[PDB]
A = this chain, B = another copy of it.
Amino acid sequence: SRRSRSEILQDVLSRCSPLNIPIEDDQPVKVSFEYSLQKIFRADVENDEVDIGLWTTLVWKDRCLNWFNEFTSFKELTVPIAEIWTPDIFIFDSVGAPEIFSDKLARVSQDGTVTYVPQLKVRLSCPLADLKLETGVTCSLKSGSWTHSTQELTLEVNAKVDLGDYASDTRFQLLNATQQVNRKQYPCCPETYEDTTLSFTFRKP
């Protein structure tokens, strides 16, 4: 490949951090979260579980060190997700372990910015009843860091929900996809925790 690029990955991977938040100063890490709802694959009336094929856009900035002076070189490199720390974002009410559709690869930038987009199929609790009716049905699932409080991780969203990718001839039509950010509390801890509640309204076409 390119030798210049080669040095970059090795320096960051070999020299530049183990799993530890590199930021010493006054910063929580914000992670932008967006959902591209690909398809609502299936509904289970007996189980009251619904399946979503989604990919999640995750963006964050990590502190990286510039060592060897940056010359005009390879600006973004791609690396396996395993190589770097990723956020704990989880669906609060998944019925089953989510499965991963896509390769675990993340693009990293010199500024330290990282973009990771997994594709996933998730089963979440939701009653399908009245899917056939014109009114349709509503489901909600909340995503957010399991462990991190708002102080440690701040979640942000650019927009409501990305319908564009949605499969044209999906079994179910999308009434409205929303991603509203909310902060709430748990009995364990005094700290506020932030999650993104994805509320999807859909019916069978």
CB atoms of A56 and B79 under 8 A apart? yes
CB atoms of B72 and A80 under 8 A apart? yes
- How many copies of this chain does the complex contain? 9
CB atoms of B146 and A106 under 8 A apart? yes
Which A105-146 residues have C-beta < 8 A from chain B?
Answer: 105-131, 133-146
Contact of A29 among B38, B83, B113 (CB under 8 A): B83
CB atoms of A124 and B108 under 8 A apart? no
Contact status of A114 and B43, CB under 8 A, knowing A1-B23, A84-B88: no
CB atoms of B159 and A118 under 8 A apart? no
The distance from the CB of A96 to the nearest CB of chain B, in whole angstroms, is 2
The distance from the CB of A28 to the nearest CB of chain B, in whole angstroms, is 2
Q: Which chain B residues border A133 with CB–CB below 8 Å?
A: 158, 187
Interface CB pairs A-B, < 8 A, 29: A2-B121, A2-B186, A4-B116, A10-B113, A10-B116, A14-B17, A16-B82, A19-B145, A27-B185, A28-B80, A29-B190, A32-B175, A40-B75, A51-B76, A74-B189, A77-B110, A81-B180, A90-B184, A91-B153, A92-B147, A103-B191, A105-B143, A105-B148, A108-B161, A112-B170, A115-B138, A125-B154, A139-B188, A151-B193
